[PDB]
């Protein structure tokens, strides 16, 4: 299970860039995706989607050493963005926020690589 510290160095640096994007106006776009909605608040979300995720769980995956490469971590971030775009309708705030966090992560994966 223990993974190389230099890979873990980057795996947290990609997510921290995604977590801390203020978008000039001073609004953290990635603050709603930190913790999943409570299952007792509205079950319709858990009924509509097949696999739930959130950045608290993605941060814990580095601590548990689940992700073995950048491709495994990218699989879950695109799946999280897909869950947002599936439940939320086109034109809403969360739909456009996940579209911004999708691009911010693609540029962050490249910057970290080279």
């Amino acid at each position: 299970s223990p993974n190389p510290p230099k890979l873990t160095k980057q795996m947290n640096a990609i997510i921290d860039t995604v977590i801390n994007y203020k978008d000039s106006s001073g609004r953290q776009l990635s603050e709603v995706f930190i913790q999943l909605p409570s299952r007792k608040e509205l079950p319709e979300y858990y009924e509509l989607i097949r696999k739930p995720v959130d950045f608290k769980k993605i941060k814990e995956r580095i601590r548990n050493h689940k992700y073995r490469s950048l491709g495994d971590l990218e699989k879950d971030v695109m799946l999280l963005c897909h869950n947002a775009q599936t439940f939320n309708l086109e034109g809403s705030q969360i739909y456009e926020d996940s579209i911004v966090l999708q691009s911010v992560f693609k540029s962050a994966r490249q910057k970290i690589a080279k």
Partner: protein, 143 residues
């Protein structure tokens, strides 16, 4: 944009009350200033909704998109609850001008393609085609 919600992150309980014969459609102005629809309110119904402080709201008709006043004003924003007391939003009909009210009745009876086949003056066809719009009123609301 000047008209947008403020990301306060402090809960604010609100009571949306529909005191009009129309199917009210609550519309929320998001953090980028764009409007967003929410579940409609049938005539003469009230529900206790969970909102946040400094969040801008405006209410229109579900079908015709005609403007509706709240607490005798165009738009509303709930502030923090004093001692956990709900904020009330009494949605009412504005006292429409007889011209604007007459347009709405003809708009519901006649189809958009058959506006210019009516026996009326040239200036009234352009006024009938000028439907109620959210973005139009948001540009007008700024000052």
């Amino acid at each position: 944009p000047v008209l947008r919600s403020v990301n306060s992150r402090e809960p604010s309980q609100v009571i949306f009350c529909n005191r009009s014969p129309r199917v009210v459609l609550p519309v929320w102005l998001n953090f980028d200033g764009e409007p967003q629809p929410y579940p409609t309110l049938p005539p003469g119904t009230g529900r206790r909704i969970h909102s946040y402080r400094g969040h801008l709201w405006l209410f229109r008709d579900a079908g015709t998109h005609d403007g509706l006043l709240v607490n005798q004003t165009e738009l509303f924003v709930p502030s923090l609850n004093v001692d956990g007391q709900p904020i009330f939003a009494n949605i009412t009909l504005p006292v429409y001008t007889l011209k604007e009210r007459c347009l709405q009745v003809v708009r519901s009876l006649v189809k958009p393609e058959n506006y210019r086949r009516l026996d009326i003056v040239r200036s009234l066809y352009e006024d009938l085609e000028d439907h109620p719009n959210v973005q139009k009123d948001l540009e007008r609301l700024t000052q």
